Amino acid sequence: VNSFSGYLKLTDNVYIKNADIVEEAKKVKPTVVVNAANVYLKHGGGVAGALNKATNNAMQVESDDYIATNGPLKVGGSCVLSGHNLAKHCLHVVGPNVNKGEDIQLLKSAYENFNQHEVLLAPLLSAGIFGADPIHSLRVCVDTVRTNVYLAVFDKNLYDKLVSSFL
Numbered sequence: 001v002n003s004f005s006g007y008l009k010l011t012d013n014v015y016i017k018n019a020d021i022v023e024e025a026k027k028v029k030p031t032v033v034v035n036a037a038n039v040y041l042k043h044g045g046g047v048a049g050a051l052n053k054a055t056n057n058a059m060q061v062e063s064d065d066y067i068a069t070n071g072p073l074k075v076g077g078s079c080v081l082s083g084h085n086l087a088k089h090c091l092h093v094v095g096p097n098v099n100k101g102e103d104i105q106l107l108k109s110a111y112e113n114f115n116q117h118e119v120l121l122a123p124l125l126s127a128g129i130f131g132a133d134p135i136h137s138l139r140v141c142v143d144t145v146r147t148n149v150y151l152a153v154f155d156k157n158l159y160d161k162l163v164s165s166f167l
């Protein structure tokens with residue numbers, strides 16, 4: 001038993017809700033919140049900008065130190081950093097950005113990072129400003145993640161489309 005509420009169950013291990021991941025994180029304090037990161041951990045907009053804003057820019061300060069030490073992430077890769085006031089940990093995961101021409105097949109590699117964590121609150125990778133089809137992203141999530149994932153979908157119209165079209 002865990003503290004996530006109001007989720008619709010899609011499969012044995014994947015759950016989905018219409019929610020703001022920031023507010024969802026603020027209430028649940030999950031062990032892991034997933035950020036929709038880029039390779040530079042520049043959290044300017046989308047999910048990353050909202051998560052970072054909710055940390056009063058502490059996420060960005062920590063991220064800049066990480067990059068100065070380690071260099072950029074790989075597309076499809078991830079790193080674990082602090083969850084600040086939102087979660088114990090933040091798993092920064094880089095899905096391919098279609099608006100940068102990155103290969104969509106890397107989306108499966110991106111979701112594989114979730115399997116290193118027993119339970120996660122997450123957005124749909126490569127959705128939103130990353131330009132992928134959220135329905136495809138949901139399919140890859142279901143077919144790749146084996147750990148327990150709670151997906152927060154900000155837009156109510158998209159949420160309804162994702163549920164109604166789910167196979």
Ligand SMILES: C[C@H]1C[C@@H](C(=O)O)N1C(=O)c1cc(O)nc2ccc(F)cc12
Pocket residue numbers: 021046047050123124125127128129134152153154155156158159
């Ligand atoms: C994860 C992808 C799918 C879509 C969604 O969750 O609905 N995403 C967003 O990043 C997003 C979109 C949108 O229209 N408003 C948003 C408002 C706040 C926020 F933090 C994210 C969004």
